[PDB]
Structures are given as structure tokens and as C-alpha cells.
Amino acid sequence: CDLPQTHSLGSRRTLMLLAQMRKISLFSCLKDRHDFGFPQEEFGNQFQKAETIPVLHEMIQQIFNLFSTKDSSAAWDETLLDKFYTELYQQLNDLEACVIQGVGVTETPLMKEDSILAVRKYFQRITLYLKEKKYSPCAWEVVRAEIMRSFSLSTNLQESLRSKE
Amino acid sequence: SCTFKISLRNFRSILSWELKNHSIVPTHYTLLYTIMSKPEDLKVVKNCANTTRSFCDLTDEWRSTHEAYVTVLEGFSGNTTLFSCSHNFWLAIDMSFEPPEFEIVGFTNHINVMVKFPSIVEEELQFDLSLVIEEQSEGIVKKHKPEIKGNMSGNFTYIIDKLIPNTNYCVSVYLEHSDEQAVIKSPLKCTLLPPG
């Protein structure tokens, strides 16, 4: 587990991989876009130090599964996806490490799973849109943007140092 | 053209738009922005609307420092829109930090690097980055990235040693995030310390 807050490269790398995974301009996609409603009250609220670790583990799992789909693997570049899968699994192991050890992670009530359920539902909405859009590149770009906006705010719990109040 | 360029002047993001004048010459422009989450909330920066300025600066307008703000420019030719190009920039990929002044003092055996960063409290600003001090002694290119935490709040003092007299070094100030992509190689300052 990562007890001392020295630095972090996991989120940084994953964030970069998603950036290089771009195909077209996002502003050129003003149609296949819609607020998916990224749950923040179950991410940044209450959950902070280690509390969001179980959520992140299952969240990345959803990301992994979604991107490992034959549909996603045919939308992005396999070369980038290869490292993406690697980084995702790397971070997955990093997160579950705290769950393996006797750290105060799974100490919270059913709320530790409730946040996860919210993620599964969030991704379900995404997949639903993808199905309707027939997994078009424009839709994927926005979907990727959502995952990019959500994932960044996922590890942001420790990366946040703007307001102490 | 629609060439957009952004520069960070003392933690402040200033963006400028380069437009060529073939025939029509638009003297006024309007800059709008939004988040990457959903391009449905189009917002326009005050003062940077219907103005004769070719650049727009902001301070707290960009709250999503951990996101990619999409850029859109509306080119108006007097009283009619001519063109509108779409672009996007990632702060964690660019973050061009050049304006900050940097000094270096070469002694008989050690180098005193002193970067002048904006005096600000790190506990009041979310800034995830790794400042790297570039070194080039006698042509030898080297890079050093020390503890930025609590050191980028003002004069960044870094001591470079393990060298020999007559070493001409060129120091550059750049930063990395996920990888060595944001190579903002600022004007290399070449200084020669006492020879031998």
C-alpha cells in the first residue's frame, strides 16, 4: 500500500495514454455528446484517504473491460491499448494492494459498494449510448473524454491541493 | 489559419490566436471555451469578447486544471462571422512555462542555480508537475529533477557539482508530467565558471 504521499505516476501515465488515443477534435463532436452524469458525491465526497480505493479498483475494472471489448479494440489503436491494459492492471494491483494489506479500506459499511454500483450504472449509460451510436468514432471520442474526466477526478483525491478549506 | 498558442505566465494562462490576412482583415475577435466532459456548456471570457485584443488572459476562469479545455474562436469581419475553428489543449501535456526568470552562478567547483518562480503558497494551488533543471556542461547534456514540493514557491535554489573547472553550462527550465513530452525548453542560459 502507498502510505507516504511522495509522488504518483500511475494517473499521469493513464491520462497521457488516453490523450494519445485521440483521433479527431472534440469540439467537432457537438452532436454525439450528452451529460452522462459522473457521480462525484460518491467519489470526492466522504471518500478521500483510502476510502475511495475499493471504488477505484472496480472502476478501473469497468474501464478495462469496456476498452478490452472487441468494439473498443477496433476503435482505438491496439498499440496504445496494449499499454493501456498494462497500466490499468498495474494501477489495479496498486489499489488492491491496500485491500490485501490490513489497511483501513474495507471498513466502511455498504457505502463502499454503493459507490461502485454507481460506477457500474454510469458505465451502463455509456455503453447504452455506444450501442445506439453504433460505436461511432465521434461517440467514442466523447465517451473517452468522459472516462478521461472521471478517471482524472478519481485519483484527484490526493492530487487535489487547491483548497484546504 | 486558426493557429492557437497558449503560454503560462506566472501560473496564469494566456492564449493568443494567430490569424493570417489574405483579403479580409478582421480587427476584432471573440474567444469561447468549455470543458472536455460535455461541449454543451459554451462559455465566453469577459473582456475577451468583441475586443480588439489578440490575446486573452485568465486567472480562476479555468478551474479544471486537471482537464482539457476546448478552444473555439469566432472570427468576425466587421459585422459578420467569417470562420470558426475548433481546437483542444491539455494542461497536463502543455503547461508552457517560459516567462519565469532564471539565474545561475558559476563558482570554482559548484553551480548555484536560482530560478525565480512566482511567490505563491503551494497549499493554496493544485499544481502537479515535475520541474526539471537542464544542464549542459561543455556540451554534456544532463537533466536534474529535484523535490518541487515546497521549492517552487519562490527562488528555486539548486546546486550542481561533480564537475571540473572551465565548464560552460547551459541551463534550461522545463517540466515533465507523465513523460518527457512537455519539453518546454526555455532559452538556455550559458554560463562559464572559472577555468583551469
Whether residue A29 and residue B67 make contact (CB cut-off 8 A), yes or no, is no
Q: In B, what residues contact A, Cβ < 8 A?
A: 35-40, 65-68, 70-72, 86-88, 90, 92-93, 122-128, 130, 177-179, 181
What lies within 8 Å, CB to CB, of B72 at 6+ separation is A27, B31, B32, B33, B34, B42, B84, B85, B86, B87
- A119 backbone dihedrals φ, ψ, rounded to 5°: -65, -45
Query: Cell 482524472 identifies what position?
Result: A152
Its domain, for residue A84, covers 1-165
For residue B106, the distance in angstroms to the closest alpha carbon of chain A comes to: 31
Number of domains chain A is built from = 1
Whether residue B36 and residue A161 make contact (CB cut-off 8 A), yes or no, is no
Q: In chain A, which residues have their Cβ closer than 8 Å to the Cβ of B122?
A: 161
For residue B191, the distance in angstroms to the closest alpha carbon of chain A comes to: 32
Q: Pseudo-torsion of CA A157, A159, A163, A164, nearest 10°? A: 70
Q: In chain A, which residues have their Cβ closer than 8 Å to the Cβ of B92?
A: 12, 15-16
How far apart are alpha carbons A43 and A119 in whole angstroms?
10
Give which of B62, B67, B59, B60 is closest to B90, Cα–Cα. B67
Query: CB–CB of A5/A150 below 8 Å?
Result: no
What lies within 8 Å, CB to CB, of A50 at 6+ separation is A98, A103, A104, A105
Query: CB–CB of B135/B142 below 8 Å?
Result: yes
User: Nine-digit cell at A127?
Assistant: 455503453
Between A137-159 and A10-20, two packed helices, what is the crossing angle to 10 degrees?
A: 160
Whether residue B128 and residue A28 make contact (CB cut-off 8 A), yes or no, is no
Whether residue A161 and residue B86 make contact (CB cut-off 8 A), yes or no, is no
> Hey, what domains does chain B have and what are their CATH numbers?
1-96 (2.60.40.10), 97-196 (2.60.40.10)
Judge whether A158 is closer than 8 Å to chain B, CB to CB.
no
Residue B144 three-state SS: strand
User: Nine-digit cell at A17?
Assistant: 495514454
Query: CB–CB of A57/A103 below 8 Å?
Result: no
Whether residue B86 and residue A28 make contact (CB cut-off 8 A), yes or no, is yes
- B166 backbone dihedrals φ, ψ, rounded to 5°: 75, 45
**For residue A72, what is the domain's CATH number?**
1.20.1250.10
How far apart are alpha carbons B3 and B75 in whole angstroms?
13
For residue B57, the distance in angstroms to the closest alpha carbon of chain A comes to: 20
Question: What are the residues facing A62 on neighbouring strands?
Answer: none
Question: What are the residues facing B68 on neighbouring strands?
Answer: B90
Whether residue A27 and residue B39 make contact (CB cut-off 8 A), yes or no, is yes
